[PDB]
Amino acid sequence: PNYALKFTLAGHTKAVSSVKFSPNGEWLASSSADKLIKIWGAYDGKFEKTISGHKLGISDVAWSSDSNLLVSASDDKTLKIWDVSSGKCLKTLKGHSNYVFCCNFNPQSNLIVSGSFDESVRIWDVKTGKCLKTLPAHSDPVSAVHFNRDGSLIVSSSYDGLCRIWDTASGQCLKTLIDDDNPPVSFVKFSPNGKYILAATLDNTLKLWDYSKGKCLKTYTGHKNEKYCIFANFSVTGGKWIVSGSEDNLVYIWNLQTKEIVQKLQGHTDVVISTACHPTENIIASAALENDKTIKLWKS
Numbered sequence: 001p002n003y004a005l006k007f008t009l010a011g012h013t014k015a016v017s018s019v020k021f022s023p024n025g026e027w028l029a030s031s032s033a034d035k036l037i038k039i040w041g042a043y044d045g046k047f048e049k050t051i052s053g054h055k056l057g058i059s060d061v062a063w064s065s066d067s068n069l070l071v072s073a074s075d076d077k078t079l080k081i082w083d084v085s086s087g088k089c090l091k092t093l094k095g096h097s098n099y100v101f102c103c104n105f106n107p108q109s110n111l112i113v114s115g116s117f118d119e120s121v122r123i124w125d126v127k128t129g130k131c132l133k134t135l136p137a138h139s140d141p142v143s144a145v146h147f148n149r150d151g152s153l154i155v156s157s158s159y160d161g162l163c164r165i166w167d168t169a170s171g172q173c174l175k176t177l178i179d180d181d182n183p184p185v186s187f188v189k190f191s192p193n194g195k196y197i198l199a200a201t202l203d204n205t206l207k208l209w210d211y212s213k214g215k216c217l218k219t220y221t222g223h224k225n226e227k228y229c230i231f232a233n234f235s236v237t238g239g240k241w242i243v244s245g246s247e248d249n250l251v252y253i254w255n256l257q258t259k260e261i262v263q264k265l266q267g268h269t270d271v272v273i274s275t276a277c278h279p280t281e282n283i284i285a286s287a288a289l290e291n292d293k294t295i296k297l298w299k300s
């Protein structure tokens with residue numbers, strides 16, 4: 001593949017924590033330590049609007065499946081749901097007793113999952129803003145939470161070194177993924193077809209798990225990840241890649257099945273905390289920490 005820099009997006013006055021393409025493919029949303037959400041044109045990199053409300057910085061942000069709603073996870077121990085077009089804050093989800101780190105809508109977008117430094121995972125009702133469930137998920141901060149394709153499953157990861165898979169409806173743990181040693185898991189998500197999960201660990205290692213068999217299938221290295229919870233992705237619109245940020249300021253792209261680094265992206269001046277893949281085009285968004293403060297758009 002041949003991702004080349006097309007756009008640099010400037011505006012956040014602090015570190016960007018997370019970037020996400022809207023499912024309809026028209027927008028990019030960005031979260032920052034500057035307590036703000038910014039929305040950008042996915043194709044032209046053009047600034048669109050600021051969404052504000054959080055009392056502290058934001059670690060994560062997620063789109064509903066109809067691109068109308070945003071959820072954001074903040075250090076002010078709350079989530080807020082946002083009507084994107086109007087800018088309204090529709091609900092504030094309160095219940096976490098520490099930094100909310102990660103969040104996600106289910107496909108049906110009637111639920112939100114959140115993971116927190118209170119070591120718990122919570123399931124929220126979108127429409128009412130009420131917490132449906134609280135799972136005793138981990139013995140250390142929750143780094144990532146994610147629904148599978150049909151929303152039946154949740155996967156969560158944690159500095160405790162574990163990935164657990166949860167039944168959305170009943171809240172019971174269906175599986176604990178554990179390998180030959182448990183370095184902290186910094187990131188986790190299902191593959192789009194929901195057959196696999198990708199997990200990132202603070203030992204400079206990406207791992208592709210077959211979660212039904214419960215066996216680790218592929219491993220992806222060469223990048224540097226010993227400290228931050230760096231988002232990683234499946235790119236599936238062109239070839240099949242793994243895409244991850246890295247603490248050496250590069251964006252890394254691997255061939256999924258042969259595991260070879262096929263492209264390193266240059267440009268950022270600080271840790272690439274976050275990357276995102278466009279739902280229908282060969283586009284990547286990447287974002288960096290305090291010394292860089294920019295978002296880059298790469299097209300292939």
Ligand SMILES: C[C@H](NC(=O)[C@H](CCCNC(=N)N)NC(=O)[C@H](C)NC(=O)[C@@H](N)CO)C(=O)NCc1ccc(/N=N/c2ccc(CO)cc2)cc1
Nearest residue numbers: 015017018032033057058059060075099101102227228229
């Ligand atoms: C701005 C950025 N924020 C974060 O790295 C994370 C969210 C990263 C992306 N979000 C996601 N993956 N869901 N958030 C935070 O650190 C805190 C909770 N919140 C904020 O910073 C917000 N203001 C904005 O995100 C940051 O640099 N925080 C400071 C920091 C300090 C130490 C650290 N790990 N340091 C270590 C970790 C482990 C070890 C030994 O194992 C040693 C050092 C990791 C981060």
